Amino acid sequence: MKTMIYPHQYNYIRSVILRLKNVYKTVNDKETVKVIQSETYNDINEIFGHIDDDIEESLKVLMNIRLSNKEIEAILNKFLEYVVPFELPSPQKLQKVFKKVKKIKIPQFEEYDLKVSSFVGWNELASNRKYIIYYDEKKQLKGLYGEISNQVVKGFCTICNKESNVSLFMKKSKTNSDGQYVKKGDYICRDSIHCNKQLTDINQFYNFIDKLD
Amino acid sequence: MEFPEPVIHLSVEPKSKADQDKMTQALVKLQEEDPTFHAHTDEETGQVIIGGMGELHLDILVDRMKKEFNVECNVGAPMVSYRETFKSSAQVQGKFSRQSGGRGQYGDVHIEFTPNETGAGFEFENAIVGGVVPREYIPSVEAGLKDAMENGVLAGYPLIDVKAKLYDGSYHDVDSSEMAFKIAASLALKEAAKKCDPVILEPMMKVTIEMPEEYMGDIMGDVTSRRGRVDGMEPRGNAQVVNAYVPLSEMFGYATSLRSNTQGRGTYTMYFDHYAEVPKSIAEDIIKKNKG
Ligand SMILES: [Zn+2]
């Protein structure tokens, strides 16, 4: 009867560990550590309406100050049971979306990365464009492409809304009958993989798409 | 046995802003002295990252810093840096006509600009008219307009980058000189300043305060003395999460004072909150430096 389909929740679980794991190293106090522990514990707890014995046991391990990376690995691997990874679209499905893009091919990603990524966006340094493919709420494959600046600066991307090496994703609207359109570029993290692991909320990414057109 | 040590990166964060200038100046002379290493001012978790071959090579470098440049820094530290700028919308006129070198030069353009600091921006639209006729001639002028722009303004930051629309222009047939075009951009930027009103800069940044309680009257007072606006304030055992926000990104001495005030038991996290303006004093400082 165990069934859940929310990649964002799984990503969020591993993301809240940052305010805690970092505190286990940067914070030279014990009270602040306990405060963050309470947050992290409640954060994951609020997700699982019905926590099981193992989930509770795993949460108990997270409460330990000596939370090694191996302990986390075991816990994360156990949480994967309540979720599902991403899927790589076949050439026929890809060409079905990118009908105007001939000779297009998705790079071979890693299995681990495909378990923590909700959207695949690779950059092509041929014409300076990034191709982003994902799945919407209707379980349909949707993909788009936009120009990228030949420079890597630091900024706040609209997607994960964090701080990392970013760039620009320029996209134009659908050209009307007159041949007119509107241009709209936004800041995007160059490495979509590193950005995927920073996806606090999928709605943040969905909002970005809502701003692209 | 040999020591297989290739490239190693070390962070060398300075003490104050004076040391920052010293470091920047040091990087210049040092890189010219020995081009066998690299130094960058970006990274993900640092201020000044230096990378070279061999750990001994690194020691020689840090030695020069404190011994020759007398810069106070700490090897192996984390840090960050930002700076935002944009506000208002309007239509700017750009005209440049001169003849100070035998040949004549003329530039006439009409552009409209709008803000887009929401999660960041960066866009220059083209209307396929004005100084362009052919279809494949539109990306040329649009990219060219940004080339000059990046030479007068700053691009590539948290919540920045303008969104303009090229809707008109007049060129006819004249000579194109870089210096003449670059100086023209500066002139138009000046004309737009008094018209569009350039303020706001860095918006309101929310900061979650975390530190032991029992000093509510002291802690809160120190926060208000930093122009902090408190939204939440819930305790947890001995400490308390004071969900606040201060219109200022980064940590311009904020961490230094906080560290001392909490004895090294106080932390926070900055995040974009709302479209507001930074401290008038700091805002006018950077706007003055940018015009100096
Ligand atoms: Zn990102």
For chain B, the straight-line distance linking the first and the last C-alpha, in angstroms and rounded, comes to: 56
Would you list the DSSP string of A49-61? SS--HHHHHHHHH
**Distance between CA atoms of A44 and A59, rounded to whole angstroms?**
9
Domain chopping of chain B, boundaries:
1-76, 87-199, 200-292
Subunit contact A32:B239, Cβ cutoff 8 A: yes
Strands A153-156, B49-53: pairing is: unpaired
For chain A, the straight-line distance linking the first and the last C-alpha, in angstroms and rounded, comes to: 40
Subunit contact A187:B42, Cβ cutoff 8 A: no
Q: From the CB of residue B190, how many other CB atoms can be counted at a distance below 10 Å?
A: 12
**Distance between CA atoms of B137 and B240, rounded to whole angstroms?**
60
DSSP 8-state secondary structure symbol assigned to residue B225 = T
**Distance between CA atoms of B292 and B288, rounded to whole angstroms?**
6
Dihedral-angle region of residue B43 (phi above 0 means left; psi in -120 to 50 means alpha; beta otherwise): left
Instruction: Say which residues have a Cβ less than 8 Å from residue A129's Cβ, sequence separation at least 6.
Output: A123, A145, A146, A147, A148
Residues with CB under 5 A from ligand 1 (ion): A 157, 159-160, 189, 195
- Binding residues of A, by number, are 157, 160, 189, 195
Cβ B127 vs Cβ B167: under 8 Å: yes
Strands B239-246, A119-124: pairing is: unpaired
**Distance between CA atoms of B202 and B251, rounded to whole angstroms?**
13
Question: Which 3 state secondary structure label does DSSP give B284?
Answer: helix
How much distance in Å is there from the Cα of A189 to the middle of ligand 1? 4
- Provide the CATH number for the domain formed by B1-76 in this structure: 3.30.70.870
How much distance in Å is there from the Cα of B158 to the middle of ligand 1? 12
Dihedral-angle region of residue B83 (phi above 0 means left; psi in -120 to 50 means alpha; beta otherwise): left
How much distance in Å is there from the Cα of A196 to the middle of ligand 1? 7
Strands B163-170, A141-147: pairing is: unpaired
**Distance between CA atoms of B233 and B247, rounded to whole angstroms?**
19
Distance from CA of A31 to the nearest CA of B (A): 6
Cβ B19 vs Cβ B71: under 8 Å: yes
**Distance between CA atoms of A189 and A130, rounded to whole angstroms?**
11
Please name the residues between 161 and 190 in chain B that touch chain A, using a CB distance below 8 Å: 161, 163
Q: Enumerate the residues of chain A whose CB falls inside 8 A of the CB of residue B215.
A: none
Q: Extract the tokens encoding B159.
A: 């919540």
Q: Extract the tokens encoding B163.
A: 């969104």
Name the CATH topology of A1-85: Monooxygenase (1.20.1280)
Say whether B200-292 and B1-76 share the same fold: yes
DSSP 8-state secondary structure symbol assigned to residue B263 = T
- Nearest residue to B113 (alpha-carbon basis) of B170, B153, B140: B153
Please tell me if residue A187 touches chain B, with a CB cutoff of 8 Å: yes
Question: Which 3 state secondary structure label does DSSP give A141?
Answer: strand
Report which residue type is found at B2.
Answer: E
Please tell me if residue B156 touches chain A, with a CB cutoff of 8 Å: yes
Max CA pair span of chain B: 79
Name the CATH topology of B87-199: Ribosomal Protein S5; domain 2 (3.30.230)
Cβ B137 vs Cβ B96: under 8 Å: no
Q: Extract the tokens encoding A73.
A: 């690995």
Helical residues (DSSP H) of chain B, grouped into ranges: 17-33, 55-68, 138-149, 178-196, 216-224, 254-261, 280-289
**Distance between CA atoms of A130 and B211, rounded to whole angstroms?**
43
Q: Extract the tokens encoding A63.
A: 């409460």
**Distance between CA atoms of B202 and B283, rounded to whole angstroms?**
8
Subunit contact B121:A186, Cβ cutoff 8 A: yes
Q: Extract the tokens encoding B18.
A: 């004076």
Distance from CA of A92 to the nearest CA of B (A): 31
How much distance in Å is there from the Cα of A112 to the middle of ligand 1? 18
Question: Which 3 state secondary structure label does DSSP give B15?
Answer: coil
Domain chopping of chain A, boundaries:
1-85, 86-213
Instruction: Say which residues have a Cβ less than 8 Å from residue A113's Cβ, sequence separation at least 6.
Output: A193, A196
**Distance between CA atoms of A32 and A35, rounded to whole angstroms?**
5
Please tell me if residue B236 touches chain A, with a CB cutoff of 8 Å: yes
- Which of A32, A158, A161 is closest, CB to CB, to B265? A32
Report which residue type is found at B207.
Answer: V
In sequence order, the β-bridge partners of residue A34 are none
Report which residue type is found at A91.
Answer: P
Q: Enumerate the residues of chain A whose CB falls inside 8 A of the CB of residue B82.
A: 154
**At CB < 8 A and 24+ separation, what contacts does A209-213 make?**
A211/A158, A211/A184, A211/A186, A211/B118, A211/B119, A212/A144, A212/A146, A212/A169, A212/A171, A212/A184, A212/A186, A213/A171, A213/A173, A213/A174, A213/A184
CATH number, domain B200-292, options 1.20.120.420, 3.30.70.240, 3.40.640.10, 3.40.309.10: 3.30.70.240
Would you list the DSSP string of A41-105? HHHHHHH-SS--HHHHHHHHHHTSTT--HHHHHHHHHHHGGGS-------HHHHHHH-TT-TT--
**Distance between CA atoms of A68 and A73, rounded to whole angstroms?**
9
Cβ B10 vs Cβ B76: under 8 Å: yes
